Amino acid sequence: EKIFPDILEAIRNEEIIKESKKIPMPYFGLFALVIFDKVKGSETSLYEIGEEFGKMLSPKNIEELKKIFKLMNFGDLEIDENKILLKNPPYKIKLSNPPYQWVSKEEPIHDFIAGILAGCLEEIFYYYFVVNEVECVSQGKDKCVFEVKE
Amino acid sequence: EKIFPDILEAIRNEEIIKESKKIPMPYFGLFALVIFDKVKGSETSLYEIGEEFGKMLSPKNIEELKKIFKLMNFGDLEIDENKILLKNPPYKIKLSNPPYQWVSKEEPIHDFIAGILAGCLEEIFYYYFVVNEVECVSQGKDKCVFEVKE
Ligand SMILES: [Ca+2]
Ligand SMILES: [Ca+2]
Ligand SMILES: [Ca+2]
Ligand SMILES: [Ca+2]
């Protein structure tokens, strides 16, 4: 599309993000649903799209990863940097006040966000992670909990 | 995805839309850009996705089409119902305060919105329209102007 050049600049410009229109999450999620209906005739997943999305956000450090989530309005990420610098995986990342708080489901629903975390983390630390959501607000928990490996 | 059932209910529930998190448009547009990078190995367009998106919004009348655009935060649509009931196409629809007001481009940029209008209009009047954006805020105009045919 013709608008795509302008989008990569926009995500680097915090003033554009702050001054831009804000769209309710449901419509955001409708977009994905509609495409996946015209992706199927071919196959990717939402985790994988999140991985590419987080690559593209390319945060500089964990603090910028936290700020980008607040900008996006995806909630408050808890990440222990001190543990990340020093200790070995698994790491654990919590997400408070995430999108789709109104959804009730047996299994965790934030696959897209898990991928985002995976791709942002490789952009910061320059090696590949896999991120798996093991608890979710969807199950009546207070926070989403994501285990981070490799 | 597992979240997709909940999305169709959400877009029918105005309280969910009102209470949900609001995401800056740039991130919304990044999502599309990232998918289209994993759609290409196959081919649709953004107009066509908008057509399907507007089908899915399925507004009841033109007034609900205006309210849905305000809910979504895609701006103030001007549509003359009196002309639409009586007279023959072309119709003209204006959009004030649309998304991507910060983008500057020679050709109009709201292809996705043009499709949305096309699909919402067939959901209201039960026959097919084609909608073409002929002026855009991207060109320094005050409003986006869309011509509606068939
Ligand atoms: Ca990299
Ligand atoms: Ca890089
Ligand atoms: Ca129909
Ligand atoms: Ca219908």
Ligand SMILES: [Cl-]
């Ligand atoms: Cl939400």
Ligand SMILES: [Cl-]
């Ligand atoms: Cl915007």
Ligand SMILES: [Zn+2]
């Ligand atoms: Zn979750």
Ligand SMILES: [Zn+2]
């Ligand atoms: Zn326009």
